[PDB]
Amino acid sequence: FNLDVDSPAEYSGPEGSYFGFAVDFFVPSASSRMFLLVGAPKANTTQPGIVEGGQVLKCDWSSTRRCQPIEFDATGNRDYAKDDPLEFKSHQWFGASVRSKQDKILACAPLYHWRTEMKQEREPVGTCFLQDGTKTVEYAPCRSQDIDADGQGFCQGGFSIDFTKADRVLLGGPGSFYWQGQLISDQVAEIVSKYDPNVYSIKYNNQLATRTAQAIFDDSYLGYSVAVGDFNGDGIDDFVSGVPRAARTLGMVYIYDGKNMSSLYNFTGEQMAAYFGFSVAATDINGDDYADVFIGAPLFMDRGSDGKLQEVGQVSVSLQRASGDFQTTKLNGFEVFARFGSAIAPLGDLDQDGFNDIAIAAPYGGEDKKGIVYIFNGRSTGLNAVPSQILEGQWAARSMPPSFGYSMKGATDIDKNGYPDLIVGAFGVDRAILYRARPVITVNAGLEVYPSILNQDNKTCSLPGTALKVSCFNVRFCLKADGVLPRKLNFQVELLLDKLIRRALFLYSRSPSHSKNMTISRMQCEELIAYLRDESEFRDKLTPITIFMEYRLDYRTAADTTGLQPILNQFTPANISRQAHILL
């Protein structure tokens, strides 16, 4: 609910380059500045003879929102022999998957094809470039001697990627072994160490990889999506991956142990061709330190308001029990054909209530199919199924649908305001947007009216104007407030006496209202004296007197150095009421 949708940083790329197809954060260990990593996989480069090799751009959060491409590789196609190209980089979709951890930047080109060494082929083994600090090495674990579709020839390694917290890459290859798919994991140190620019098939000693299986498992697309998280409680991140075409297109999700690549648990979709596994995510959503599994199926059909099936998409939320099992519920999309669940981004704790949050996109939802992103909050009981915020795509369809939300990345505090922010890509219009998390203020208000039964003849206080004594009572209101926050928070409180011919007025003002510019540091009460009017001035002594308080937003002066104004917690009551009564 606290994402600033008012002053977002808007980045754009070269037209048609599919800038925004993949996003991530750049947080270098030389913790100077922070940057947005955006893939533009159809971008033209300066590589000699290479049409649309694609590139990954580094965008400056600084001040000028100008992006500068990162030169991973400037060369053209290597030759195996004279007039015999070794590789083919045109339309390789470099930047189709971008992933960053500290200074490590891993991007891949899943449509990179190579010749093989024994024939003149064009086989999409896929390749990646890993840029550590100073060095920059190539990573193509699927470019091997096990060639052709029988082996790793069409593996498209790097179709999905991620890092574990122990410096392993997890790479997904959906094409290996007749599109059985494959998961490969190598240590980041071994990828950079054993790299040799004259060796086309590098052997890694500490390599984890799934092996070829029976033919009934062909056409599974294991590695279409990947994510990391511990699921057998050993502190080592395990490998979760969507297998969207398995089980006769019911789709499945495999979980593999991060030590020896052995199978841990499986999920199975419930509907045919829903693309169960199009996206996966792993994050603890109910604050119990057991990572929870999010499995998107953006083609899932539910029942509409009528009896017809309608494409709305479905995300399954699987809570990891310590007993090894999962407690799973299911969350459906809202708009037909919106592809709810195409991308699932763990946000961290977007409002910092102690429970992690998550975003789920419907890249073709909203008005004019400009894209929608839903924010879901966590709590002890799981995911709150009612979204607390809806981020709408702002750019109209140029040529293609903008696909706002098709990729997204969170869990990084890029402004160091104490709250993590969110990057949303819109590659259909060559755009990426950074949404700032506003800080959340919790306010505790009080309102007391004593004495509450008002005696017209108990005229104690003197009306400060005249000399006539009046029947008086106390109205006491309290206020308390508490990220990185301004010390003095300025609150505007307004009070109103009586429900309707206001029969009760404040002593020092003879008015039914008050108003006060009070200041809280992250108690505070203020006492007042109000009085009844004379018995002859009004009839009706039967209607009660409602005392209505109403505290208001901290307005301009609460803004941060960036103009980022905090927000009151979504639970915040707008007002409080009390009552006093007159006797007979």
Partner: protein
């Protein structure tokens, strides 16, 4: 109150397409604060209704033997169909795969002849409309006889792209406002939405016709259709689909049939020999069941169906909106109850009730007593 406004009786030489199989056709219901108003719909299966059948066949290499056994299907199916219809038209289309990496090989050699060099395979293609709907089965045999088998790399094929084209290309296929049959013949599974991402196709199928010289030219640009997308456009363009797939993929396509309304599965023989009897069995299966659908209904108002089918078997719940075992010319009846609650704006709500697979519809106009 309930007042019927239009009620031409059901039909019973020569007859065009102005046959009445559903009555009444338009009525108005005035609805009190939660008062069920019930009316009766009568359906009579027309004795002699014309048929359009478009034959969409997998022409990948595993279908080589099948392509040979279809060189005469136009005349053979036409003669068999005369025992059912007086007005029959036939068409033919072929499909293989998206013509991009990684679904096909992209070597210059394999782009010319995707098969094992020895065979006489033509290049892979997305969808070819060989012959638009015509009554001249002689032309069907001639043109199918000239078609060449193709091939590609991965086992599941690209038929869903071709299905979408056949349904939404309308006059270029030749569809009349009659009973429309689309025969889908294949010996492998299918690709669907999401699969395009491997070839960098990351834009959903847009559900428009994109034929040039009877070729689909946008398979490199639009993803495969989803099940739901095919459902929408098959229903909207009123096409009943017959899945003629080999035994080993019976489980897959039988589940597909359960998701596609007015679809049928038959078991295709080796070289596709029983295609005629398979089609006949499918039509009888499709023609012996009527399924009513209603358009989008307003919030707060509810609708219920009761069926009174043959042999006095009365079905309730979701069984009330369908009847089976309907012989040619038979009559069945449905009573539909509408009950209200609040009352929306304009007081002029009008939705349609329609039998799946037919153009005729009943306009039910609603009035809410506020």
């Amino acid at each position: 109150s309930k007042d019927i406004k239009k009620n031409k009786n059901v039909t019973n030489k020569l007859k065009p397409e102005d046959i009445t199989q559903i009555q009444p056709q338009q009525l108005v219901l005035r609805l009190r604060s939660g008062e069920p108003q019930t009316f009766t719909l009568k359906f009579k299966r027309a004795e002699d209704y014309p048929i359009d059948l478009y034959y969409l066949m997998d022409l990948s290499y595993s279908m080589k033997d099948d392509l040979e056994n279809v060189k005469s299907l136009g005349t053979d199916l036409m003669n068999e169909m005369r025992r059912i219809t007086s007005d029959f038209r036939i068409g033919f289309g072929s499909f293989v795969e998206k013509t991009v990496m990684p679904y096909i090989s992209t070597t210059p050699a394999k782009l010319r002849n995707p098969c094992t060099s020895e065979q006489n395979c033509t290049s892979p293609f997305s969808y070819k409309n060989v012959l638009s709907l015509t009554n001249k089965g002689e032309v069907f045999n001639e043109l199918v006889g000239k078609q060449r088998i193709s091939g590609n790399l991965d086992s599941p094929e690209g038929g869903f792209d071709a299905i979408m084209q056949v349904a939404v290309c309308g006059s270029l296929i030749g569809w009349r406002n009659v009973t429309r049959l689309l025969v889908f013949s294949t010996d492998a599974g299918f690709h669907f939405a999401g699969d395009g991402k491997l070839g960098g196709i990351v834009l959903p199928n847009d559900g428009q016709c994109h034929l040039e010289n009877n070729m689909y030219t946008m398979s490199h640009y639009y993803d495969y259709p989803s099940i739901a997308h095919l459902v929408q456009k098959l229903s909207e363009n009123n096409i009943q689909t017959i899945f003629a797939v080999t035994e080993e993929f019976q489980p897959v396509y039988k589940e597909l049939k359960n998701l596609i309304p007015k679809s049928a599965v038959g078991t295709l023989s080796a070289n596709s020999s029983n295609v005629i009897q398979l089609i006949i069995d499918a039509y009888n299966s499709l023609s012996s069941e009527v399924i009513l659908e209603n358009g989008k209904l307003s919030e707060g108002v509810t609708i219920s169906y009761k069926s009174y089918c043959k042999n006095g078997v009365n079905g309730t719940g979701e069984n009330g909106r369908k009847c089976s075992n309907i012989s040619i010319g038979d009559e069945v009846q449905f009573e539909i109850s509408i009950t209200s609650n609040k009352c929306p704006k304009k007081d002029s709500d009008s939705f349609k009730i329609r039998p799946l697979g037919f153009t005729e519809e009943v306009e039910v106009i609603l009035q809410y007593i506020c």
